[PDB]
Amino acid sequence: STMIGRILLTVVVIFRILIVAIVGETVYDDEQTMFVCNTLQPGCNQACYDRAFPISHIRYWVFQIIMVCTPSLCFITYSVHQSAGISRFYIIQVVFRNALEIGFLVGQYFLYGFSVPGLYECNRYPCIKEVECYVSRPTEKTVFLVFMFAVSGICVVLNLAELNHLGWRKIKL
Amino acid sequence: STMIGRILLTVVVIFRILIVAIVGETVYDDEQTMFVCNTLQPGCNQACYDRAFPISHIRYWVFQIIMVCTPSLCFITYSVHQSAGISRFYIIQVVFRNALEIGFLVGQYFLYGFSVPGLYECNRYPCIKEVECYVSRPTEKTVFLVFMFAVSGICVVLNLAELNHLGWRKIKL
Amino acid sequence: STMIGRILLTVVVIFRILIVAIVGETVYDDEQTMFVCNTLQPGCNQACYDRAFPISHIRYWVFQIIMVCTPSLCFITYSVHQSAGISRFYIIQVVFRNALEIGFLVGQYFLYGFSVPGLYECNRYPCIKEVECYVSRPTEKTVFLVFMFAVSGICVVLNLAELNHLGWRKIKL
Amino acid sequence: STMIGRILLTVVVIFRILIVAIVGETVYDDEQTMFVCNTLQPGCNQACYDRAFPISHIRYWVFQIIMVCTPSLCFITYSVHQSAGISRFYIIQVVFRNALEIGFLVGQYFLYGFSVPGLYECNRYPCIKEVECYVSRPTEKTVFLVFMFAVSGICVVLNLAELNHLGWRKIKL
Amino acid sequence: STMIGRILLTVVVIFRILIVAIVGETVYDDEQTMFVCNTLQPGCNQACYDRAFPISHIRYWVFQIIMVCTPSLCFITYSVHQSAGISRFYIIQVVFRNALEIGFLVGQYFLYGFSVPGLYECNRYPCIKEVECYVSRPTEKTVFLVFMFAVSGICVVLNLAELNHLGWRKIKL
Amino acid sequence: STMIGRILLTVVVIFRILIVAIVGETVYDDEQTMFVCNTLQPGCNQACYDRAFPISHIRYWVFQIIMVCTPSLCFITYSVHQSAGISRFYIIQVVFRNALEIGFLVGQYFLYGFSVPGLYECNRYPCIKEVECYVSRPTEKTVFLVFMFAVSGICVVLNLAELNHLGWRKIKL
Ligand SMILES: C=C[C@H]1CN2CC[C@H]1C[C@H]2[C@H](O)c1ccnc2ccc(OC)cc12
Ligand SMILES: C=C[C@H]1CN2CC[C@H]1C[C@H]2[C@H](O)c1ccnc2ccc(OC)cc12
Ligand SMILES: C=C[C@H]1CN2CC[C@H]1C[C@H]2[C@H](O)c1ccnc2ccc(OC)cc12
Ligand SMILES: C=C[C@H]1CN2CC[C@H]1C[C@H]2[C@H](O)c1ccnc2ccc(OC)cc12
Ligand SMILES: C=C[C@H]1CN2CC[C@H]1C[C@H]2[C@H](O)c1ccnc2ccc(OC)cc12
Ligand SMILES: C=C[C@H]1CN2CC[C@H]1C[C@H]2[C@H](O)c1ccnc2ccc(OC)cc12
């Protein structure tokens, strides 16, 4: 069943790209404009927001998508160069895709967790002692995070199935 | 009369996609900017808005459109792969489309109801006791909700007619 | 003279589509941010704006354009399906186009009238008794309304001429 | 010298379209946001701005461009319809283009004049007695107005030269 | 060495167009929003900004680019008209391009100078006596100005080299 | 191994272009709007921001990308001109690309360093003595800076490998 696997993998990849490109930028538009802290100190909002969200989810997902698509670009460009052999590059391409997908999934888990809390406790200079800050659209961001995790997991499973179908002797050489 | 059914189904799908893509993003632009609560507590606006609208309508409809279109993409990609049999995949594609459409319609009803009230009563921390908040463009959003429900219902009816035409005997095999 | 009629109909349809798509969105961009009421009550602006303009003109016109273009799309897709008879679908398409155009024109008149006043008197909760609110760019919106009415009337007249050319005898059968 | 006339006319038309489409919308973006009146009365800004600028320049120019291009569209669509005679439609097209261009130029002069003053004196309700309001980017708007007038005048002269070349004898028949 | 000249000229023209189109509009986005004067008089900001920057740099550069490209458009359209002689049009086009480039460079120098100061002294009505105003991103605008001047100078030198290569006897005839 | 080098070089170039074009403009959107200084002096924010960030990172990277791509454009245009010899232009193109890449990398290091601090001490007129200002999203900008440096270094290494492969003897002649 190596064919249905490829069909599903292509469909899932396209689905993820479309969803991100269409909704992600709009969801995270006012992330910093609607972030508010209970204080009068100038500059506390900037510091607390930067501590709460070092990297936005949307940029991480864009980077992940491009990086995961890169090996296919390598293979296609190699094929173009060859004309005006290819049965070996394919195995290495598959292995690299598997490694990249797994690494990105693990990194997402270790960076963001599984939910976006509605409150944040911040104690960065210049804020005096510890202050409380309030996040914008926590529930939508939680839903987006869980959905992206599920899609990435499906992709990982399909890639592992493909790699197993090839056989580890192909991967060895 | 299986041909007029397909014609109407295609026309309705295109109509829904066009309407959403052209007007939806503009209707819901200032959903959070124009949401106001009668209070002085910092952070009450964020909490009350997040409780009132956990997920925006437009994002739900975009997700629904992509998911409903997915099975046709699966079928087209399978057909492409086959060349450089297909009479069985079509039945499963139809069944999956029917199930997805019905599920999305039911989910929309259970999530949003049939109207958007102009007032909201919010009792989420940090708001003190219970406060009153006011929504932006409730009437336009109600009209949009009802129109989308009607279009989805028409799609469901056409899909059921198609599935009935194919037949239960054929579906079983 | 059934040819010049078709030429003019196509030209006016394209003209209307272009004008709307190019200027309408920009005209109605700040409709709600520049709407102000003389009061101190929170939430009175939202209620009064929603009562004054239940549906924006631009969205009504977009819906009208798509709906009016739908029958031609149905005819085209039926023609595509036929290859890989058509002289009867054409009459029904013409009749449906006539009905839709007339209905949309009448609806526009009954919804918006012929002018956009510069003042509004609002007595919706939470506003206390009666308040006075001030509209943004009333004159430009009045000009746009009248222009759209005139274009739609021209389209209706051309469609009626076409339908008369076809003849009642043919329409009946 | 009927050929260089056509070459110059085409080049000028393209030049005008490009200039408008590229810069006009950006010039007039903050026309109402940066318009300020010296008063405390709510709603005086809206009334005074609407009285000072009933129709924005950019929208008038867009309408003019589309209307002037319409007759060529009529001719092209007629030519397409003819295949799957034309030496007479051309003369009427030229005459209509001349009339439209002259009318639009005269209308622009009678609507806007030749300059945009930096101050405005406004006595519209609800403003008390007479107030003073201040315009945004008067000099750039004056330059744009004069440039558009010059380009339209060049177009009118070229069209008149073409019409004279065709001849009154031919035009009458 | 008439070929490398043409190659470099084409490359430089494309480079200038790309740089402007990509960064210019973003650099000058908040030119008026971030312009502030030290006063309490309503309307002083508008007058002082209009006096300081009668025409934005970006619009001047867009106009220059279109005007400089115009003669090539004239030549191409003439060539198209000729088919369904040309060795004399080309020299006239070269001369016109040289004149336009030199004129635009001189005009830029006389209009803007070589730097954008960070302070402005403004004494325009309604400002009382003389006030001080502060500009936004003076350094980036200075860098952009110098870069555009250098690119235009390179273009002028290449055009002069081409014209000299053609020879004076040939331009006279 | 001169083919895999070219494959990797093309892939990394495309990757860098995509990442910049997609995320850079959004990261640096509110650079000046969210920059705040602890003072009451009008005009201190503008001066301090201009001193802290003379040129935005995104514009520098756009300029670098276009300049690095220029030599390939020159070579392609020369090839087009040649038809309707080339083995010597290629070496000079490679050398120029190497020089440009190295220069841009060194310039980036000397201009921006390796991190974006969260605080800035500013003593520019009109600010009184020293003031403290707070930056927006320092961590994301630091990550972007480091990532761009790494990608540029990889490109430099690949270019040096290519140049070494061609040979010093060949480069001399
Ligand atoms: C369909 C979405 C629209 C929004 N952005 C501008 C117009 C349209 C294209 C998209 C962007 O160019 C873009 C192009 C390609 N890939 C993208 C991937 C992600 C993205 O934002 C997360 C924007 C992307
Ligand atoms: C026609 C609408 C315009 C508004 N958005 C940017 C330019 C144009 C395209 C559209 C967006 O890229 C987009 C592309 C494709 N499908 C879409 C589907 C939905 C949507 O918003 C709900 C935006 C979509
Ligand atoms: C020409 C207008 C521009 C403004 N909008 C984005 C870029 C360009 C396209 C248009 C929009 O995508 C769009 C596409 C197609 N039909 C439309 C119809 C109506 C509309 O606004 C009323 C926007 C439309
Ligand atoms: C080149 C200009 C850009 C700005 N607008 C969106 C993207 C690009 C296209 C243009 C608009 O779609 C548009 C299309 C066609 N004709 C137009 C004519 C005028 C215009 O504004 C006055 C905008 C136009
Ligand atoms: C690549 C730049 C993007 C920004 N603007 C909208 C989308 C893209 C196109 C460009 C504009 O339509 C445009 C088109 C063509 N020539 C232009 C020249 C100059 C310009 O701004 C100075 C904008 C231009
Ligand atoms: C894919 C990104 C989207 C955002 N901008 C508008 C729509 C889409 C295109 C891009 C811009 O036109 C653009 C075109 C080409 N090269 C670019 C390079 C850089 C850039 O910003 C740093 C914007 C670029």
Side-chain angles (χ1 to χ4, degrees):
Chain A
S1 65
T2 186
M3 62 317 304
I4 51 137
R6 281 187 191 95
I7 307 283
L8 292 202
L9 188 57
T10 299
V11 167
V12 169
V13 162
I14 286 155
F15 178 69
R16 173 169 67 183
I17 288 167
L18 283 169
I19 284 296
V20 171
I22 292 174
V23 287
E25 224 200 85
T26 294
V27 169
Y28 295 79
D29 196 51
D30 61 357
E31 44 182 344
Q32 175 160 44
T33 291
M34 286 283 157
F35 185 94
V36 72
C37 299
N38 192 314
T39 188
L40 270 177
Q41 184 70 44
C44 186
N45 272 6
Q46 282 80 1
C48 292
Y49 174 84
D50 186 65
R51 191 71 187 195
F53 305 106
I55 297 156
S56 194
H57 301 171
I58 186 61
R59 275 163 275 287
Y60 181 87
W61 291 328
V62 167
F63 183 82
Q64 154 171 11
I65 284 167
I66 304 318
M67 259 291 256
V68 168
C69 285
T70 275
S72 301
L73 223 57
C74 257
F75 183 59
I76 291 312
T77 279
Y78 173 102
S79 275
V80 166
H81 166 90
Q82 202 74 314
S83 304
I86 69 101
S87 151
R88 167 175 207 210
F89 205 91
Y90 171 87
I91 296 134
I92 306 116
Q93 164 210 37
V94 158
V95 173
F96 271 71
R97 209 172 48 203
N98 256 283
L100 286 172
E101 247 310 349
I102 287 169
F104 271 110
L105 190 76
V106 171
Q108 188 195 314
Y109 163 74
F110 270 111
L111 244 181
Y112 301 123
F114 285 114
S115 76
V116 180
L119 302 169
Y120 185 66
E121 265 95 53
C122 169
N123 61 23
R124 269 249 298 250
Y125 179 93
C127 314
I128 312 290
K129 307 175 208 285
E130 154 155 326
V131 303
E132 190 162 87
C133 306
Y134 311 95
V135 183
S136 170
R137 319 170 172 264
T139 307
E140 223 162 359
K141 281 154 186 176
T142 300
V143 168
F144 216 139
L145 202 59
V146 173
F147 157 83
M148 286 305 280
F149 196 93
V151 167
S152 290
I154 286 164
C155 276
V156 160
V157 162
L158 289 177
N159 274 347
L160 274 176
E162 170 42 305
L163 181 158
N164 172 31
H165 165 280
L166 294 188
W168 271 101
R169 331 336 311 160
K170 304 286 300 319
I171 295 148
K172 164 204 53 38
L173 246 168
Chain B
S1 65
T2 191
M3 62 320 297
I4 50 138
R6 273 170 200 124
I7 301 283
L8 293 197
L9 188 57
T10 300
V11 168
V12 171
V13 163
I14 286 155
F15 179 68
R16 172 169 68 185
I17 288 167
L18 283 168
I19 284 297
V20 171
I22 291 175
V23 288
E25 218 202 89
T26 293
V27 170
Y28 295 79
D29 198 53
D30 59 10
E31 47 185 350
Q32 173 157 47
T33 283
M34 285 286 165
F35 185 94
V36 73
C37 299
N38 191 312
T39 188
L40 270 177
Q41 184 70 46
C44 185
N45 272 6
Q46 282 80 0
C48 293
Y49 175 84
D50 188 68
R51 190 89 206 172
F53 306 105
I55 297 156
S56 194
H57 301 173
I58 187 62
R59 263 135 261 170
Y60 181 87
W61 291 328
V62 166
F63 183 82
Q64 152 170 10
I65 284 167
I66 304 318
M67 263 297 255
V68 157
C69 286
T70 275
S72 301
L73 218 64
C74 257
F75 182 59
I76 289 280
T77 279
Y78 168 90
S79 273
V80 163
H81 166 90
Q82 201 74 314
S83 304
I86 70 99
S87 149
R88 175 182 197 208
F89 204 90
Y90 172 88
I91 298 129
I92 308 111
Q93 174 230 309
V94 159
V95 172
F96 260 85
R97 209 173 48 203
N98 257 283
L100 285 172
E101 250 307 2
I102 288 169
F104 271 112
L105 190 75
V106 171
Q108 188 195 314
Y109 163 74
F110 270 111
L111 243 184
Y112 301 123
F114 285 113
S115 75
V116 181
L119 302 170
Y120 185 67
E121 290 110 25
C122 167
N123 64 3
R124 268 248 302 247
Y125 179 92
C127 314
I128 312 289
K129 310 172 206 282
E130 154 149 317
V131 302
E132 190 162 88
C133 306
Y134 311 95
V135 183
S136 173
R137 326 177 173 251
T139 309
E140 218 162 358
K141 282 155 185 174
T142 301
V143 168
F144 215 139
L145 202 60
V146 172
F147 157 83
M148 289 299 294
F149 195 93
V151 166
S152 291
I154 286 163
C155 277
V156 161
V157 161
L158 289 177
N159 273 348
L160 274 176
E162 170 38 297
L163 174 152
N164 173 27
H165 168 280
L166 264 200
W168 146 267
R169 50 304 191 190
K170 260 142 289 183
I171 290 157
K172 149 176 318 313
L173 321 175
Chain C
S1 64
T2 199
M3 59 317 302
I4 50 138
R6 270 171 202 122
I7 305 283
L8 292 203
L9 188 57
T10 301
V11 167
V12 299
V13 162
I14 286 156
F15 179 68
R16 172 169 67 184
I17 288 167
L18 283 168
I19 285 297
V20 171
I22 292 174
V23 287
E25 256 209 45
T26 294
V27 170
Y28 294 79
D29 194 52
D30 64 352
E31 58 203 305
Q32 174 158 43
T33 59
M34 277 303 167
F35 184 95
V36 72
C37 299
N38 191 312
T39 189
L40 269 179
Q41 184 70 46
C44 186
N45 273 7
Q46 281 82 1
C48 293
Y49 174 84
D50 188 66
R51 192 73 184 185
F53 305 104
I55 296 156
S56 194
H57 301 172
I58 186 61
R59 271 168 284 283
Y60 181 87
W61 291 328
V62 166
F63 183 81
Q64 153 171 7
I65 284 167
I66 304 318
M67 263 297 258
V68 155
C69 286
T70 275
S72 301
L73 189 77
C74 216
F75 181 60
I76 288 281
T77 204
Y78 167 90
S79 185
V80 155
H81 165 90
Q82 198 69 301
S83 304
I86 69 97
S87 153
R88 172 174 192 211
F89 206 93
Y90 172 86
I91 295 125
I92 304 132
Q93 173 232 322
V94 158
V95 172
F96 261 84
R97 210 172 47 203
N98 265 82
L100 285 172
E101 250 307 3
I102 287 169
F104 271 112
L105 190 76
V106 170
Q108 187 194 313
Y109 163 74
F110 270 110
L111 245 176
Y112 301 123
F114 285 113
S115 76
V116 180
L119 304 169
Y120 185 67
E121 292 110 38
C122 169
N123 64 3
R124 267 253 288 248
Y125 179 92
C127 314
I128 314 289
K129 305 173 222 278
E130 270 230 345
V131 301
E132 192 161 87
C133 306
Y134 311 95
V135 184
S136 172
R137 320 167 168 264
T139 308
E140 217 162 354
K141 281 155 186 175
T142 300
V143 167
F144 216 139
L145 203 59
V146 173
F147 157 83
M148 292 295 307
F149 195 93
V151 167
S152 290
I154 286 164
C155 280
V156 161
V157 161
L158 289 177
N159 272 346
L160 273 175
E162 167 45 305
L163 173 154
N164 175 26
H165 168 280
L166 293 189
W168 150 272
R169 53 286 200 200
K170 260 142 289 183
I171 289 158
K172 154 60 53 50
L173 61 86
Chain D
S1 65
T2 181
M3 59 317 302
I4 51 138
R6 282 187 191 95
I7 306 283
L8 292 202
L9 188 57
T10 299
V11 167
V12 169
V13 163
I14 286 155
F15 179 69
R16 173 169 67 183
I17 288 167
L18 283 168
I19 284 296
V20 171
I22 292 174
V23 287
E25 224 200 80
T26 294
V27 169
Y28 295 79
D29 196 53
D30 62 356
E31 58 201 311
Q32 173 160 45
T33 290
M34 286 284 158
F35 185 94
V36 72
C37 299
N38 192 314
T39 188
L40 270 177
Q41 184 70 45
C44 186
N45 273 6
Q46 282 81 2
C48 292
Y49 174 85
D50 187 66
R51 190 52 157 214
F53 305 106
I55 296 156
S56 194
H57 301 171
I58 186 62
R59 275 163 275 288
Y60 181 88
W61 290 328
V62 167
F63 183 82
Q64 154 171 10
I65 284 167
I66 304 318
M67 261 293 260
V68 168
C69 285
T70 275
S72 301
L73 222 60
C74 256
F75 182 59
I76 292 312
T77 290
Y78 174 80
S79 145
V80 161
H81 165 90
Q82 197 74 329
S83 304
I86 70 100
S87 148
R88 166 175 207 210
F89 204 91
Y90 171 87
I91 295 136
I92 306 115
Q93 163 209 36
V94 158
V95 172
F96 259 85
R97 210 171 47 203
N98 264 85
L100 285 172
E101 247 310 349
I102 287 169
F104 271 110
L105 190 75
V106 171
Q108 188 194 314
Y109 163 74
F110 270 111
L111 248 177
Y112 302 122
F114 285 113
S115 76
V116 180
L119 303 169
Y120 185 66
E121 265 95 53
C122 169
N123 61 24
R124 258 255 291 263
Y125 178 93
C127 314
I128 311 289
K129 308 171 207 283
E130 160 155 320
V131 303
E132 191 162 87
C133 306
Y134 311 95
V135 183
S136 170
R137 319 170 172 264
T139 306
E140 207 156 29
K141 280 154 187 176
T142 300
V143 168
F144 216 140
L145 203 59
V146 173
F147 158 83
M148 287 305 280
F149 195 93
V151 168
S152 290
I154 286 164
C155 276
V156 160
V157 162
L158 289 177
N159 273 346
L160 274 176
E162 170 42 305
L163 181 158
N164 173 31
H165 167 280
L166 294 190
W168 144 264
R169 46 302 186 194
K170 260 142 289 183
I171 285 156
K172 142 151 55 63
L173 272 38
Chain E
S1 65
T2 174
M3 59 317 302
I4 50 139
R6 279 178 192 107
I7 306 283
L8 294 196
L9 187 58
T10 299
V11 167
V12 170
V13 162
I14 286 155
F15 179 68
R16 172 169 68 184
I17 288 167
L18 283 168
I19 284 296
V20 171
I22 291 175
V23 287
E25 221 200 85
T26 292
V27 170
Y28 295 79
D29 195 52
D30 62 354
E31 49 187 344
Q32 173 157 48
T33 288
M34 277 302 163
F35 185 94
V36 72
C37 299
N38 192 313
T39 188
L40 270 177
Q41 184 70 46
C44 186
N45 272 7
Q46 282 80 1
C48 292
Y49 175 84
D50 188 68
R51 193 73 185 186
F53 305 105
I55 297 156
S56 194
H57 301 172
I58 187 62
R59 283 167 259 295
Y60 181 87
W61 290 328
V62 166
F63 183 82
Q64 152 170 10
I65 285 167
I66 304 318
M67 263 297 255
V68 157
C69 286
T70 275
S72 301
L73 215 64
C74 257
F75 180 57
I76 286 300
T77 279
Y78 174 79
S79 146
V80 159
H81 165 90
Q82 197 74 329
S83 304
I86 70 99
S87 149
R88 172 174 203 239
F89 217 81
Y90 155 79
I91 299 98
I92 303 150
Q93 192 218 142
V94 159
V95 172
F96 258 86
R97 209 173 48 203
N98 265 84
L100 285 173
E101 250 307 2
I102 288 169
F104 271 112
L105 190 75
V106 171
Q108 187 194 313
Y109 163 74
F110 270 111
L111 243 182
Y112 300 123
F114 285 113
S115 76
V116 181
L119 303 169
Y120 185 67
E121 265 95 53
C122 168
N123 64 4
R124 263 253 301 256
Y125 179 93
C127 314
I128 312 289
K129 310 171 206 280
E130 154 149 320
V131 302
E132 191 161 88
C133 305
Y134 311 95
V135 183
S136 173
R137 326 176 172 254
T139 309
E140 218 164 359
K141 282 155 185 174
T142 301
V143 168
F144 216 139
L145 203 60
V146 173
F147 158 83
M148 289 299 295
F149 195 93
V151 167
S152 290
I154 286 164
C155 277
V156 161
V157 161
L158 289 177
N159 273 347
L160 274 175
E162 170 39 299
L163 174 152
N164 174 28
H165 165 280
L166 272 182
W168 318 103
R169 291 313 57 61
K170 281 56 38 163
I171 86 174
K172 263 112 184 167
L173 269 40
Chain F
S1 65
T2 166
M3 59 317 302
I4 50 138
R6 271 171 201 123
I7 307 283
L8 292 203
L9 188 57
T10 301
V11 168
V12 299
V13 162
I14 286 155
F15 179 68
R16 172 169 67 184
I17 288 167
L18 283 168
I19 285 297
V20 171
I22 291 174
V23 287
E25 211 165 271
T26 294
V27 170
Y28 295 79
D29 195 52
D30 62 355
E31 57 205 306
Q32 173 159 45
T33 283
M34 277 305 169
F35 185 94
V36 72
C37 299
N38 191 314
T39 189
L40 269 178
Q41 184 69 45
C44 186
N45 273 7
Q46 281 82 0
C48 293
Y49 173 85
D50 189 66
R51 192 73 184 186
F53 305 104
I55 296 156
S56 193
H57 301 172
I58 187 62
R59 276 163 274 288
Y60 181 87
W61 291 328
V62 167
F63 183 81
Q64 154 171 9
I65 285 167
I66 304 318
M67 263 300 258
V68 157
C69 286
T70 275
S72 302
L73 209 66
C74 216
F75 182 60
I76 291 309
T77 279
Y78 174 80
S79 147
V80 157
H81 165 90
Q82 198 70 302
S83 304
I86 68 101
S87 156
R88 169 174 197 212
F89 206 92
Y90 172 87
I91 296 125
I92 304 133
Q93 173 232 321
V94 157
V95 172
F96 259 84
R97 210 172 48 203
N98 265 83
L100 285 172
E101 250 307 3
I102 287 169
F104 271 112
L105 190 76
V106 170
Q108 187 194 312
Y109 164 74
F110 270 110
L111 242 181
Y112 301 124
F114 285 113
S115 77
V116 180
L119 303 169
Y120 186 67
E121 292 110 43
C122 170
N123 64 2
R124 266 250 293 246
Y125 179 92
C127 314
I128 313 289
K129 305 171 219 276
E130 270 230 345
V131 301
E132 192 161 87
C133 305
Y134 311 95
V135 184
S136 172
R137 320 173 174 255
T139 307
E140 219 164 356
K141 282 155 185 175
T142 301
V143 167
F144 216 139
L145 204 59
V146 173
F147 158 83
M148 294 295 308
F149 195 93
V151 167
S152 290
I154 285 164
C155 280
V156 161
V157 161
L158 289 177
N159 273 346
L160 273 176
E162 170 42 305
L163 173 154
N164 174 26
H165 167 279
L166 265 204
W168 144 261
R169 61 289 191 185
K170 299 260 286 273
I171 289 158
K172 169 78 47 43
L173 62 87

